Amino acid sequence: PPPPPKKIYNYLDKYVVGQSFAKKVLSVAVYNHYKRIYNNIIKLEKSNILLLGPTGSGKTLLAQTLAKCLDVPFAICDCIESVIAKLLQDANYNVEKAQQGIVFLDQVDKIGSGEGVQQGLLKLLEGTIVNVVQVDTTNILFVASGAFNGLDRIISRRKNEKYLGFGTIEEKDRLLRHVEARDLIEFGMIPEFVGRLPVVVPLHSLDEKTLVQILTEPRNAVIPQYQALFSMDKCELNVTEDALKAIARLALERKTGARGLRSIMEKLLLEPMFEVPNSDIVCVEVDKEVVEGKKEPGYIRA
Amino acid sequence: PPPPPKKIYNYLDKYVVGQSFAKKVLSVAVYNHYKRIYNEKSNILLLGPTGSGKTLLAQTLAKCLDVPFAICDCESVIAKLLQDANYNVEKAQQGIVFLDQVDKGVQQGLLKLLEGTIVTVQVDTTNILFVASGAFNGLDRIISRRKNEKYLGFGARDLIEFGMIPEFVGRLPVVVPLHSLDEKTLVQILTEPRNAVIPQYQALFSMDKCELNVTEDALKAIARLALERKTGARGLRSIMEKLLLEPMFEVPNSDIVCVEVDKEVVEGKKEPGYIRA
Amino acid sequence: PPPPKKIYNYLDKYVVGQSFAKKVLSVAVYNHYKRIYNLEKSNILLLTGSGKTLLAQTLAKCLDVPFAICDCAKLLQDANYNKAQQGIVFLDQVDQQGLLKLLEGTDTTNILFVASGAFNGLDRIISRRKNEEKDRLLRHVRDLIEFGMIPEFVGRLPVVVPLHSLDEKTLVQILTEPRNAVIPQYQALFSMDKCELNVTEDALKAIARLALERKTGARGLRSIMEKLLLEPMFEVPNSDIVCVEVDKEVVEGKKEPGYI
Amino acid sequence: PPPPPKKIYNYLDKYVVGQSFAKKVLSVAVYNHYKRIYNNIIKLEKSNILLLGPTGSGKTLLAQTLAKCLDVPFAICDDIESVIAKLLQDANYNVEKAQQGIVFLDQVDEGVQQGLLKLLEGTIVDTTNILFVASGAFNGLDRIISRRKNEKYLGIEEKDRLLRHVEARDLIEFGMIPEFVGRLPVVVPLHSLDEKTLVQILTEPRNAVIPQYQALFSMDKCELNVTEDALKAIARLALERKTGARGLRSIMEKLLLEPMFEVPNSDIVCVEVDKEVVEGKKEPGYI
Amino acid sequence: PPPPPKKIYNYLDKYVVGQSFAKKVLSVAVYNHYKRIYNNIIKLEKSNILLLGPTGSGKTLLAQTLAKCLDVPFAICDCDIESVIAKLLQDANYNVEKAQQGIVFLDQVDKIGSGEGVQQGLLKLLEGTIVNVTVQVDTTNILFVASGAFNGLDRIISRRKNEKYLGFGTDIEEKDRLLRHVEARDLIEFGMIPEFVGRLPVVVPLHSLDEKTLVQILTEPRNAVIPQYQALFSMDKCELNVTEDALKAIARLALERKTGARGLRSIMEKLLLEPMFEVPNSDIVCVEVDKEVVEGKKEPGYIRA
Amino acid sequence: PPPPPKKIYNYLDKYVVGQSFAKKVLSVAVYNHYKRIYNNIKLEKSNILLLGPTGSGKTLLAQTLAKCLDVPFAICDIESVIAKLLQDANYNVEKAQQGIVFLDQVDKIGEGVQQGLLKLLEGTIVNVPTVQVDTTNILFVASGAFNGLDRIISRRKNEKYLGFGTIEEKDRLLRHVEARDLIEFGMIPEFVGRLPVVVPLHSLDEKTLVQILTEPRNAVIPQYQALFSMDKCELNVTEDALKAIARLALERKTGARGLRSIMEKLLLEPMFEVPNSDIVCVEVDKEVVEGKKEPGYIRA
Ligand SMILES: Nc1ncnc2c1ncn2[C@@H]1O[C@H](COP(=O)(O)OP(=O)(O)O)[C@@H](O)[C@H]1O
Ligand SMILES: Nc1ncnc2c1ncn2[C@@H]1O[C@H](COP(=O)(O)OP(=O)(O)O)[C@@H](O)[C@H]1O
Ligand SMILES: Nc1ncnc2c1ncn2[C@@H]1O[C@H](COP(=O)(O)OP(=O)(O)O)[C@@H](O)[C@H]1O
Ligand SMILES: Nc1ncnc2c1ncn2[C@@H]1O[C@H](COP(=O)(O)OP(=O)(O)O)[C@@H](O)[C@H]1O
Ligand SMILES: Nc1ncnc2c1ncn2[C@@H]1O[C@H](COP(=O)(O)OP(=O)(O)O)[C@@H](O)[C@H]1O
Ligand SMILES: Nc1ncnc2c1ncn2[C@@H]1O[C@H](COP(=O)(O)OP(=O)(O)O)[C@@H](O)[C@H]1O
């Protein structure tokens, strides 16, 4: 049987901190797609899916995480028939298997108004048969992604919060939570393309606990992978729990998402990484003072 | 023989609820074209909102159309019609071609189809019914700028202006605007058509051993919200999706057997009702 | 080439109001193909709202010369790739200098051109130069350069024609007399089925008046007359009605056609 | 052996009326070219000839007139190779005549000027021997010259008479790139056409307008006849219209409209226009 | 074993003067790039390197010299996007199993500031995607060093560092100091897509050339300017003697050219035009260059055989 | 073996009258290149920028210097530049990579060409559509007018000490072109830096115009004398008349382009009347050039 959304939600919870709304929406949508194929083999029309998440909040990771769980053909592509050619050779020419796949459209929010692809996608987000052999996009489920760089400003205009004079990141979380199709049209999309993608979700921008959580909680969290590199040097990196807070704050201040974590860590680790190679240091300690920059990292020597 | 347009209006009344006063024109034009098949071109253009039946009318008309049909949107489209459908080239000349999104070099080239021409064999395509469609986004603004003046004190021409060539505006001889939907349409659209939105969601929940009841007051509220975004026949889907996400998160394998929706629930004042073993 | 006498007899049947312009077009083209039968051409400018594209296709249907339409190669396709440069090019919306060598040979040296355009304010420019009344002023049409046309472009347009531009009673003739007038076509349409279709002579009077008050030329007669006969076409069929009639106040929206 | 310049002048004299000075300079320019190609087949350089034209002076027809007798491949226009390929097509791709040809460039009056700069000088795209001839109506250059006319700010023949004193200082002041002007060493002003020159233009040229129209009515079983005062009256109105030789054809076509229709079907034997006919006060009295 | 950072820094120091921070970052990174190759054969992922510096002052030289010390294929190109992997695959003798371990150097990335459309195209080769080299090849491991001049990026860091600021608030020294504060928001403010800044984690400021560093550049490193010129004169069998004060004068003159390492050539070229023109067959034994000679107070002295 | 630089100076002096300083820099530039293409088969090239106030040697310097070159040369106004060079060397890649390429009209660029040419100048692989080529050994000689740079440099030299907190000039001032000035003209410092050698060409004087008319090869008056000998007639121009021609060129302020425009005007009537209208010789005195006399004709 199709796995439930609580299996998928337990699975996605193993890689992305929370994002419970996006995790729920992906889960219910995939389940609805799998269930529909059992029946469809009244027509059961698909609903295309939209992710509005900013940089560094895991949109590609959510796709790539779901990708490792999909028992259904899936395609990864980025902003035409080569996309389905991927899916078809993924299938190994089983046309019936591809005709039920799910496609991820990375960086839809980059395309604006080329627009001819937006025009072109109208009749591929909706069903048409297409050659390479013919197969029909009618069931192919689309998941759309991008930062929609301006869209927050459009939402605030649509909310009239930018009004002035007399008249009759938490902020960004609130605004993105109230996206409207009026805004997605205004971000350079054609309204027909906004008219499809009936399900849209914000991904909430990551918070202070989320970043501290990201440093250890996920599989391949940031601290685990650094200390593995030090482990080849026969050294254990250790960081006090209080230093993780300032790192998170500093990377939150970088306004560049979870991948900003490695930049701050790279800077802090810099001196240790050059001095370690053969120097008979056994273990390297990083504390609050190191993160604050007030102290060079403390070295344990044999 | 072509059935009368009021009989054709039977077929379309089964699928698009509120466009009777454009559906009337379409039905008449088809009967004229068929009365033009033997013994002026009925070629046609659909205008107005997305999500309001432009493509559904085309596919529906073909569902009663004995002669083969092609739909396309903006030279091998007839090749699609010819290859799959057409065994008979007079039937292929007798085909119906829908050109949607036309309002989105080709315009000059379509004059060779709008007049019709030879534009294997290169058949005299004059017999083909070129029906056509598109958003024409902004036609109303041009019309508003022409229909009214800034009167002050105390007390086809639009299609050419939209950017279409005068020959092009002249050479699809019939045009219809289609209504923007209203709550009167939407409440019927929710349950009246075959394949309608609320039937499918109940079906989606019936395979999970549930009966979902949605009362008439719920639909009344939902129609209000669904029209606030222009996506029309897709505004139903977006707001039904947004509302029914949580019961669908908790229905599966969950020993729940019914949900009930009310105006407060649509308004967010109450959680979805569940009924359980 | 046939004398202009015969050319007039064909042309006259199709645009009744532009008697003067019919002569200029007919006489020039005969002499032109006479010199070819042996000699510079001279490009033609049509001064529109009155069937310029109708008139252009009229000559084409007469001569079967290469004919093509362009908006300010298709001709060799229109020539069926077969005279090679003796045809007519129609240039619409001429109301510029890059076509001058194209108006010359570029060969192109033989091509007769039919320019057309609504020179809005040429009356005021003629009113400037002079320091149906507006057509009578247009009958008085360097002055054309003063309206704003390129002198070099005007130089290749030495022949210029008013087009009887009011057409305001001849619409009634146009609704009736020409080779395929709209109301005779509708009679062929509805009476292709069993039904009658009388249109009273005072309905034509009001119908022409309607097109003129809307400030629509002969282009919009097929549309507006479609509206009156839409519901008749809708209500005739399925053996309902055979006797049908339209009358002047039905044009006025006051009433529905008769029946049995 | 290239023909002598006097013969080319008399040969070109047949087709364009009056303007000897421009014709004489263009005659020398062609003769010099065929002497240099005969002499470098030192290694003397080209010199391009620029024709300052009031519109309708015949500037284009004159070049065709030289092109007629000289049998040198010739082209005009107003991308860079788009003219040179036209010469290579016209030259029958004759590799030497492509190098030896003559090219017109029209209404030449910043990127376009600067891209042709090393095209006018000999460069390969082979321009090393192409004799460029050019035309331009640099209207107001006389006003630039007028501004140059000894103005001090501290304690119609005259227009031809002023254009007769043109120099490169005004043309840079006109807006031409100096490198382009330097590439155009010979500046020739065409004479403006008086009524006498326009009167000559109906009778003198090989293929003048009246011989053309008189031949069309001659093609019918008819004949076209015109008084000398009638020709003189036509010129007087034509000048008043401020239209050059382009406009003479138009004004003559207005007078002959009714005859052209009436005479066919063997109606009438001759038609005659007088001074009062020219004013439009009377229809021509066919016979 | 992979070469230690110790060796790389010492290897590069013979060719690149100063810039121990720039050398340290590159030294660590290529050693770390070796660690990934042996690990991925817990998953490690790449940190992309960005070098930004005043005009020409070591950026290209560091890359090429560092390129000389790579055991993996490398490719340097100037910012179609296929051309990156096209040249890497070509460069690797089409040995894909070694090519995917490659290091890519990008130049002039600063010039692609918002055009904007090129930034979004390489976002797939940064981080990871397969690339349609024909073959399809995966960029995920490839280590990218983005080099740009970022001319005027100091203008933005100065506006960012409150060196331009609003309200009551209550050159050489500044420029090197200012770039040492560079924030990610400054690359965003330059015109770089916030998406594209985010996947260039490691931002490396290269310091402006001090006057003493110019003195070392004249003689110390490999291919120093004066060694080049005595080779030219020794090919005319003539010697060139430059006093140490003349070095001080030349560097002081070159610092005034605001043109970095290329100014040494211009000042050196201008001085030796006549000697080089006169020596080749005049039996000149040696050429003497003093400080007054550099100052233009003397003609260059000749000693005849 | 390479020719000595002084030999190129004597050779270039035959075709170009003035500007020995420009000749000398190019002379050293060729000879340095010749040593460098042996040595590198390490040494690095210095490209050259020629500043030519309009109508002066720059395009002729390229052409006359080019005829010395055993290696190929290409003078063009972006990979087409490398394409043009490779074609001249008969697709012989080992000889083509050593060439001397002239990039004309560097002042006519905008930013895109400047910053796109950096990799060729500094050396990069480029393929002529393919043949793989390395531009490292291309010698670039660039020519551009840099119009109004004299006023730019003048302001630099005029605004100094001007604030309260403290043709003759064209030739004198333009000897002091500096990197700030080339940058300030609208050149990327990236581009100003990699053309280290800047060679300014002085304006042309009257004493030089007279010499050009007679002394160097293909001089203007001998060409007109040769043209007339082709018609079996001699052209005599006295020495005093040449002085007037140069004076008329100065007020034309079009340099060497203006000489032949002025001279061709005079020789129109001789060239129309002398052909096959038997004349022995024509003498143009100052009176004829002054426009106060018509050319005297010698006849049998
Ligand atoms: N909430 C999160 N938890 C764990 N990792 C995250 C989170 N947000 C972002 N990431 C990291 O973001 C990196 C880049 O992926 P992503 O942010 O999806 O790129 P983009 O958003 O530009 O498509 C991944 O390495 C992933 O580990
Ligand atoms: N009034 C309506 N009643 C029922 N369905 C409708 C109505 N309007 C639009 N639709 C639905 O819209 C969907 C898309 O077709 P349509 O909206 O006609 O195309 P477009 O989006 O190009 O206008 C169809 O599935 C159709 O069922
Ligand atoms: N006398 C006529 N007979 C038949 N059709 C006519 C006549 N006059 C105008 N028309 C029709 O009117 C339309 C032309 O409209 P008009 O505004 O004149 O545009 P155009 O300048 O392109 O002719 C065409 O459909 C043409 O067939
Ligand atoms: N002297 C002349 N002899 C014959 N035809 C002439 C003469 N002068 C002018 N024309 C005619 O009038 C026109 C001359 O103007 P043109 O050279 O076209 O001016 P432009 O080239 O500046 O537009 C040509 O059609 C030419 O035939
Ligand atoms: N510190 C330095 N030591 C030696 N040479 C240097 C130094 N800095 C710059 N250079 C010179 O500058 C060039 C290297 O950088 P460059 O190629 O100018 O960078 P870009 O890619 O910006 O042009 C070489 O000519 C090198 O000799
Ligand atoms: N000093 C000179 N001696 C001889 N000919 C010269 C001299 N200066 C310029 N010329 C002539 O003028 C041209 C060179 O000037 P050019 O480079 O075209 O000016 P610009 O620098 O504006 O491009 C050539 O045709 C050449 O014959």
Side-chain angles (χ1 to χ4, degrees), chain D residues 6, chain F residues 232-234 236 269-270 272-276 279 282-283 295-300:
Chain D
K6 285 180 178 182
Chain F
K232 209 173 62 177
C233 162
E234 186 57 283
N236 297 338
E269 285 295 347
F272 190 83
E273 289 297 341
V274 170
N276 307 77
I279 280 170
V282 181
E283 306 218 313
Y297 306 143
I298 305 302
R299 287 176 171 149

mmCIF file of all heavy atoms in Angstrom, chain D residues 6, chain F residues 232-234 236 269-283 295-300, unseen atoms left out:
data_model
loop_
_atom_site.group_PDB
_atom_site.id
_atom_site.type_symbol
_atom_site.label_atom_id
_atom_site.label_comp_id
_atom_site.label_asym_id
_atom_site.label_seq_id
_atom_site.Cartn_x
_atom_site.Cartn_y
_atom_site.Cartn_z
ATOM 1 N N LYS D 6 36.880 64.273 -72.042
ATOM 2 C CA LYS D 6 35.986 65.100 -72.849
ATOM 3 C C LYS D 6 34.890 64.265 -73.485
ATOM 4 O O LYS D 6 33.734 64.691 -73.549
ATOM 5 C CB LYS D 6 36.773 65.802 -73.949
ATOM 6 C CG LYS D 6 37.606 66.963 -73.515
ATOM 7 C CD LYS D 6 38.320 67.542 -74.702
ATOM 8 C CE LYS D 6 39.141 68.749 -74.306
ATOM 9 N NZ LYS D 6 39.818 69.366 -75.478
ATOM 10 N N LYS F 232 51.962 61.540 -70.805
ATOM 11 C CA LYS F 232 53.090 62.030 -71.585
ATOM 12 C C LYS F 232 53.315 63.532 -71.420
ATOM 13 O O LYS F 232 53.935 64.170 -72.269
ATOM 14 C CB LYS F 232 52.901 61.664 -73.055
ATOM 15 C CG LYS F 232 54.178 61.465 -73.825
ATOM 16 C CD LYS F 232 53.864 60.949 -75.212
ATOM 17 C CE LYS F 232 53.034 61.958 -75.984
ATOM 18 N NZ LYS F 232 52.774 61.512 -77.377
ATOM 19 N N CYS F 233 52.838 64.109 -70.324
ATOM 20 C CA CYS F 233 53.022 65.520 -70.011
ATOM 21 C C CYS F 233 53.724 65.635 -68.673
ATOM 22 O O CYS F 233 53.481 64.835 -67.768
ATOM 23 C CB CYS F 233 51.700 66.265 -69.946
ATOM 24 S SG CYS F 233 51.808 67.844 -69.093
ATOM 25 N N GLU F 234 54.584 66.628 -68.536
ATOM 26 C CA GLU F 234 55.221 66.867 -67.255
ATOM 27 C C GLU F 234 54.433 67.866 -66.430
ATOM 28 O O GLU F 234 53.793 68.771 -66.964
ATOM 29 C CB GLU F 234 56.653 67.359 -67.440
ATOM 30 C CG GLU F 234 57.417 67.484 -66.144
ATOM 31 C CD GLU F 234 57.470 66.183 -65.379
ATOM 32 O OE1 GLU F 234 56.459 65.818 -64.747
ATOM 33 O OE2 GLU F 234 58.523 65.517 -65.415
ATOM 34 N N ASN F 236 55.274 70.605 -63.548
ATOM 35 C CA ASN F 236 56.277 71.354 -62.808
ATOM 36 C C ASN F 236 55.584 72.144 -61.713
ATOM 37 O O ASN F 236 54.673 72.927 -61.992
ATOM 38 C CB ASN F 236 57.050 72.282 -63.737
ATOM 39 C CG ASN F 236 57.827 71.524 -64.776
ATOM 40 O OD1 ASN F 236 58.133 70.349 -64.595
ATOM 41 N ND2 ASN F 236 58.138 72.184 -65.883
ATOM 42 N N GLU F 269 41.620 71.086 -63.736
ATOM 43 C CA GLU F 269 41.662 71.626 -65.092
ATOM 44 C C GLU F 269 42.879 71.176 -65.878
ATOM 45 O O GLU F 269 42.730 70.894 -67.079
ATOM 46 C CB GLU F 269 41.563 73.152 -65.073
ATOM 47 C CG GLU F 269 40.174 73.635 -64.777
ATOM 48 C CD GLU F 269 39.193 73.243 -65.868
ATOM 49 O OE1 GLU F 269 39.639 72.824 -66.958
ATOM 50 O OE2 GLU F 269 37.972 73.346 -65.634
ATOM 51 N N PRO F 270 44.080 71.125 -65.313
ATOM 52 C CA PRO F 270 45.166 70.437 -66.014
ATOM 53 C C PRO F 270 44.784 69.038 -66.440
ATOM 54 O O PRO F 270 44.945 68.681 -67.609
ATOM 55 C CB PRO F 270 46.295 70.434 -64.982
ATOM 56 C CG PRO F 270 46.049 71.640 -64.181
ATOM 57 C CD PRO F 270 44.556 71.736 -64.063
ATOM 58 N N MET F 271 44.244 68.240 -65.528
ATOM 59 C CA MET F 271 43.896 66.879 -65.893
ATOM 60 C C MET F 271 42.707 66.779 -66.830
ATOM 61 O O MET F 271 42.533 65.729 -67.444
ATOM 62 C CB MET F 271 43.613 66.056 -64.637
ATOM 63 N N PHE F 272 41.827 67.770 -66.903
ATOM 64 C CA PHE F 272 40.832 67.650 -67.960
ATOM 65 C C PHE F 272 41.354 68.154 -69.302
ATOM 66 O O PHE F 272 41.054 67.568 -70.346
ATOM 67 C CB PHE F 272 39.542 68.368 -67.606
ATOM 68 C CG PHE F 272 38.426 68.058 -68.556
ATOM 69 C CD1 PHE F 272 37.673 66.912 -68.392
ATOM 70 C CD2 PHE F 272 38.156 68.873 -69.633
ATOM 71 C CE1 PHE F 272 36.651 66.599 -69.262
ATOM 72 C CE2 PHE F 272 37.132 68.565 -70.506
ATOM 73 C CZ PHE F 272 36.381 67.421 -70.318
ATOM 74 N N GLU F 273 42.131 69.238 -69.294
ATOM 75 C CA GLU F 273 42.561 69.876 -70.535
ATOM 76 C C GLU F 273 43.798 69.242 -71.154
ATOM 77 O O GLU F 273 43.893 69.149 -72.379
ATOM 78 C CB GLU F 273 42.821 71.357 -70.287
ATOM 79 C CG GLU F 273 41.570 72.161 -70.057
ATOM 80 C CD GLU F 273 40.658 72.159 -71.258
ATOM 81 O OE1 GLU F 273 41.134 71.857 -72.371
ATOM 82 O OE2 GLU F 273 39.460 72.458 -71.092
ATOM 83 N N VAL F 274 44.755 68.801 -70.345
ATOM 84 C CA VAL F 274 45.971 68.199 -70.900
ATOM 85 C C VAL F 274 45.708 66.924 -71.690
ATOM 86 O O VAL F 274 46.327 66.746 -72.749
ATOM 87 C CB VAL F 274 47.016 68.010 -69.794
ATOM 88 C CG1 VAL F 274 48.177 67.178 -70.300
ATOM 89 C CG2 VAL F 274 47.506 69.360 -69.316
ATOM 90 N N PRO F 275 44.840 66.002 -71.260
ATOM 91 C CA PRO F 275 44.645 64.767 -72.024
ATOM 92 C C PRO F 275 44.298 64.947 -73.487
ATOM 93 O O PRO F 275 43.253 65.509 -73.831
ATOM 94 C CB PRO F 275 43.486 64.088 -71.289
ATOM 95 C CG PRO F 275 43.645 64.514 -69.941
ATOM 96 C CD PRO F 275 44.051 65.957 -70.026
ATOM 97 N N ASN F 276 45.205 64.476 -74.348
ATOM 98 C CA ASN F 276 45.018 64.419 -75.793
ATOM 99 C C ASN F 276 44.702 65.777 -76.392
ATOM 100 O O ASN F 276 44.171 65.867 -77.497
ATOM 101 C CB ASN F 276 43.950 63.390 -76.144
ATOM 102 C CG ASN F 276 44.237 62.045 -75.516
ATOM 103 O OD1 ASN F 276 44.023 61.842 -74.325
ATOM 104 N ND2 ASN F 276 44.731 61.117 -76.315
ATOM 105 N N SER F 277 45.025 66.833 -75.660
ATOM 106 C CA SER F 277 45.047 68.201 -76.151
ATOM 107 C C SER F 277 46.488 68.647 -75.949
ATOM 108 O O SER F 277 46.835 69.193 -74.902
ATOM 109 C CB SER F 277 44.069 69.082 -75.422
ATOM 110 N N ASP F 278 47.318 68.398 -76.960
ATOM 111 C CA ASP F 278 48.763 68.276 -76.824
ATOM 112 C C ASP F 278 49.390 69.412 -76.029
ATOM 113 O O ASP F 278 49.389 70.565 -76.468
ATOM 114 C CB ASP F 278 49.400 68.197 -78.210
ATOM 115 N N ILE F 279 49.926 69.086 -74.854
ATOM 116 C CA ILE F 279 50.634 70.024 -73.990
ATOM 117 C C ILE F 279 51.940 69.365 -73.565
ATOM 118 O O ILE F 279 51.983 68.151 -73.335
ATOM 119 C CB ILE F 279 49.784 70.439 -72.767
ATOM 120 C CG1 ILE F 279 48.772 71.512 -73.155
ATOM 121 C CG2 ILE F 279 50.650 70.963 -71.635
ATOM 122 C CD1 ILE F 279 47.756 71.781 -72.085
ATOM 123 N N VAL F 280 53.011 70.153 -73.486
ATOM 124 C CA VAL F 280 54.271 69.612 -72.992
ATOM 125 C C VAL F 280 54.324 69.616 -71.472
ATOM 126 O O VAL F 280 54.621 68.592 -70.849
ATOM 127 C CB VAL F 280 55.450 70.400 -73.591
ATOM 128 N N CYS F 281 54.027 70.745 -70.842
ATOM 129 C CA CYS F 281 54.197 70.800 -69.398
ATOM 130 C C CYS F 281 53.309 71.882 -68.818
ATOM 131 O O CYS F 281 52.821 72.763 -69.528
ATOM 132 C CB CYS F 281 55.656 71.055 -69.014
ATOM 133 N N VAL F 282 53.107 71.797 -67.513
ATOM 134 C CA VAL F 282 52.311 72.760 -66.771
ATOM 135 C C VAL F 282 53.131 73.225 -65.586
ATOM 136 O O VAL F 282 53.797 72.422 -64.926
ATOM 137 C CB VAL F 282 50.978 72.155 -66.295
ATOM 138 C CG1 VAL F 282 50.168 73.188 -65.551
ATOM 139 C CG2 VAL F 282 50.198 71.617 -67.468
ATOM 140 N N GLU F 283 53.095 74.520 -65.319
ATOM 141 C CA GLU F 283 53.869 75.095 -64.235
ATOM 142 C C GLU F 283 52.910 75.760 -63.267
ATOM 143 O O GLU F 283 52.193 76.691 -63.640
ATOM 144 C CB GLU F 283 54.889 76.094 -64.768
ATOM 145 C CG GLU F 283 55.777 75.515 -65.848
ATOM 146 C CD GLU F 283 57.202 76.006 -65.755
ATOM 147 O OE1 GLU F 283 57.401 77.230 -65.606
ATOM 148 O OE2 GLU F 283 58.127 75.169 -65.827
ATOM 149 N N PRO F 295 46.600 77.894 -64.491
ATOM 150 C CA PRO F 295 47.856 77.190 -64.772
ATOM 151 C C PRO F 295 48.363 77.457 -66.181
ATOM 152 O O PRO F 295 47.653 77.265 -67.166
ATOM 153 C CB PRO F 295 47.488 75.714 -64.576
ATOM 154 C CG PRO F 295 46.000 75.661 -64.565
ATOM 155 C CD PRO F 295 45.523 76.979 -64.088
ATOM 156 N N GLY F 296 49.612 77.900 -66.263
ATOM 157 C CA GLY F 296 50.202 78.202 -67.551
ATOM 158 C C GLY F 296 50.531 76.923 -68.294
ATOM 159 O O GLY F 296 51.027 75.956 -67.718
ATOM 160 N N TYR F 297 50.236 76.907 -69.586
ATOM 161 C CA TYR F 297 50.361 75.698 -70.382
ATOM 162 C C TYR F 297 51.477 75.845 -71.402
ATOM 163 O O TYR F 297 51.578 76.872 -72.078
ATOM 164 C CB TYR F 297 49.049 75.370 -71.088
ATOM 165 C CG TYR F 297 47.840 75.269 -70.190
ATOM 166 C CD1 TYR F 297 46.604 75.722 -70.614
ATOM 167 C CD2 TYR F 297 47.921 74.673 -68.947
ATOM 168 C CE1 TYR F 297 45.493 75.612 -69.814
ATOM 169 C CE2 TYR F 297 46.812 74.557 -68.144
ATOM 170 C CZ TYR F 297 45.601 75.029 -68.584
ATOM 171 O OH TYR F 297 44.485 74.925 -67.791
ATOM 172 N N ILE F 298 52.307 74.814 -71.507
ATOM 173 C CA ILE F 298 53.408 74.758 -72.462
ATOM 174 C C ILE F 298 53.003 73.883 -73.634
ATOM 175 O O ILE F 298 52.585 72.735 -73.442
ATOM 176 C CB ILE F 298 54.682 74.213 -71.802
ATOM 177 C CG1 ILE F 298 55.024 75.043 -70.568
ATOM 178 C CG2 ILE F 298 55.823 74.208 -72.793
ATOM 179 C CD1 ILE F 298 55.216 76.509 -70.863
ATOM 180 N N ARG F 299 53.155 74.406 -74.849
ATOM 181 C CA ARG F 299 52.684 73.722 -76.042
ATOM 182 C C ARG F 299 53.707 73.874 -77.151
ATOM 183 O O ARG F 299 54.518 74.803 -77.152
ATOM 184 C CB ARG F 299 51.343 74.274 -76.511
ATOM 185 C CG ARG F 299 50.189 73.886 -75.640
ATOM 186 C CD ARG F 299 48.938 74.556 -76.118
ATOM 187 N NE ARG F 299 47.759 74.042 -75.441
ATOM 188 C CZ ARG F 299 46.679 74.764 -75.188
ATOM 189 N NH1 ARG F 299 46.637 76.056 -75.452
ATOM 190 N NH2 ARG F 299 45.627 74.181 -74.626
ATOM 191 N N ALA F 300 53.652 72.944 -78.097
ATOM 192 C CA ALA F 300 54.602 72.888 -79.203
ATOM 193 C C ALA F 300 54.624 74.192 -79.990
ATOM 194 O O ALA F 300 55.675 74.629 -80.453
ATOM 195 C CB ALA F 300 54.272 71.724 -80.121
#
